[PDB]
Structure 1
């Protein structure tokens, strides 16, 4: 009752409505979960390692998580020329990555579902939902809810930013999901869904577990990029490529904010191995094993921890995490073909 509650609360960052959370846990121990993402070319580390940690923690807590491959949404967002073959190949490649990274597939906990085959076979349970959603909306209300696709309002506004919010709001009920979690880039759609469900009056609102966006390799981009390699670390680069991509990141000396490495270690390395060993030499003071995150920041902001000892350890940890994925992609032929087919096309941004 309390341990599962704390484990579920540890998944998200800006949690809210704890009473609703405990009520849904007491009335439904095994809920349904999913995630909404936009497949486009390759996957960065935030959509890979952090999502794997999140789904593993939800499985350990007793929550069923489903995979939502968004191909129709990707075609609506105009990516890779709107072709279906390229987008479905990217989706299969992302599924292969999530399967090779370490997913509990044999236990029947994870379920992969494509949007096309799910909406095509259940259009009778999907058209009334989007219809009733579009009925209780307004022009400016939907224009405000156009943050998942990209820019706000003062830009080249297209009609795709009108079809996307209604479908994204209907997906929370079309997939019979009890609770769902994404990030902070969907707050307008969240409040629109809240207003619509209050206007129609149903059961109990799910719990939102928004994840903070990870900044790029330089002081400017606050999100992750799946097109430009000099913005985020992918899930298939070699050791040398990962080292080159990690040694060019913005790392201010002895500064907390503005450095993405702290958030990377907090939401990528710490929940995985449940520890953090700083690989140093015999003259620096030896190896330090950090079990949490407060002591690491306290030692880094005191004058005894330099990036010259944090970047090599982080790169070694990333290489050790990627080694199973590389081995699985090398020992298999279909995974190698998928990798060679996705590492050739263009990725729009």
Structure 2
């Protein structure tokens, strides 16, 4: 594959592909993604960091925004707690093999103006668009706060401030990104990753108990959580185990069994795996066992790299 294909692989949309091809011609180019700091870093994060690595392998300079003010505004807690988690997240992303520059969103909105541009954008942004852009983002609040409509403006400002060619995020960020293309003098190319279903099969992967696989989870925790995941036979849509096979696994993939069941199974592509599962010729428990074992191998260097630091040895 060429650079465009490597970047596009496993994305949900690129706005626009034509604009991306032009960016790829530049000698210098940069991309950002922002994260609200999270106590657990899970496959949802990993999916997107993998995409940032694709960009880095295509010669992009990578900027990671640790969105401490964003998280603060979105009711994640006190700023100092949030920043401590942010620093931990940086270590995890480093342990994933990412080469990037890391900045706190508060650095922007406080130390430059910069701060002033937030006010300028607020003049241009309707309350309606701001609130609508937060639908898939904002924490639940019966009495929605001013904080909610400041959040998207801040994200648009960070994009402008960092002067990047590309902004990356999950599909939930798309409306904020559409605002960014309307509000800033230069239109940023937007790359959106799919939303990873949680292990429970109920909405996105999040840090709720048993609902995520964290990159530093122990092998026994990975087996246990995969074993109890939502995964109905023949069902590919909304199936978090099939999603994991699609987004993280390498092929050919060998699936141990049985052989009253079709015997050992060597699957050459995800598309083949999908066909097998869809036609009910591969049972959930066999899929789960393989996915768990491969995921343990995939995440092992990350876990070890973290522990290797989490001493000084």
If the length of structure 1 is used for normalisation, what is the TM-score? Answer: 0.81
- Mapped pair 1:60 → 2:57: yes
- Mapped pair 1:37 → 2:38: no
1:238 to 200, 208, 218: 218
Unaligned segments of structure 1, at least 5 residues: 337-349
Using the alignment, how far apart are the partners of 1:233 and 1:74 within structure 2? 22
8 Å Cα contact 1:42-1:90 kept in structure 2: no
**Size of the alignment, in residue pairs?**
313
Using the alignment, how far apart are the partners of 2:49 and 2:132 within structure 1? 31
Q: Considering only aligned residues, what root-mean-square deviation do their CA atoms show, in Å?
A: 2.5
For residues 289 and 134 of structure 1, do their structure 2 counterparts lie closer, same or farther at Cα, with a shift above 3 Å needed? same
* Stretches of 4+ aligned residues off by more than 6 angstroms: none
Using the alignment, how far apart are the partners of 1:156 and 1:335 within structure 2? 47
Of the structure 1 ranges 244-253 and 228-237, higher mean CA displacement relative to structure 2 is found in: 228-237
Using the alignment, how far apart are the partners of 1:166 and 1:335 within structure 2? 40
- Mapped pair 1:215 → 2:197: yes
8 Å Cα contact 1:11-1:57 kept in structure 2: no
Paired residue for 2:3? 4
Using the alignment, how far apart are the partners of 1:190 and 1:332 within structure 2? 36
Using the alignment, how far apart are the partners of 1:66 and 1:286 within structure 2? 47
Paired residue for 1:224? 205
Using the alignment, how far apart are the partners of 1:222 and 1:335 within structure 2? 38
Larger strand proportion, structure 1 or 2?
A: 2
| Shift in Å, 1:35 | 0.7
- Within 5 Å, give how 1:74-113 maps onto structure 2: 74-79=71-76, 81-84=77-80, 86-103=81-98, 105=99, 110-113=100-103
| Shift in Å, 1:289 | 3.6
Using the alignment, how far apart are the partners of 2:152 and 2:107 within structure 1? 20
| Shift in Å, 1:115 | 2.6
Paired residue for 1:299? 276
Using the alignment, how far apart are the partners of 1:182 and 1:248 within structure 2? 29
For residues 137 and 43 of structure 1, do their structure 2 counterparts lie closer, same or farther at Cα, with a shift above 3 Å needed? same
| Shift in Å, 1:334 | 5.1
Using the alignment, how far apart are the partners of 1:274 and 1:99 within structure 2? 26
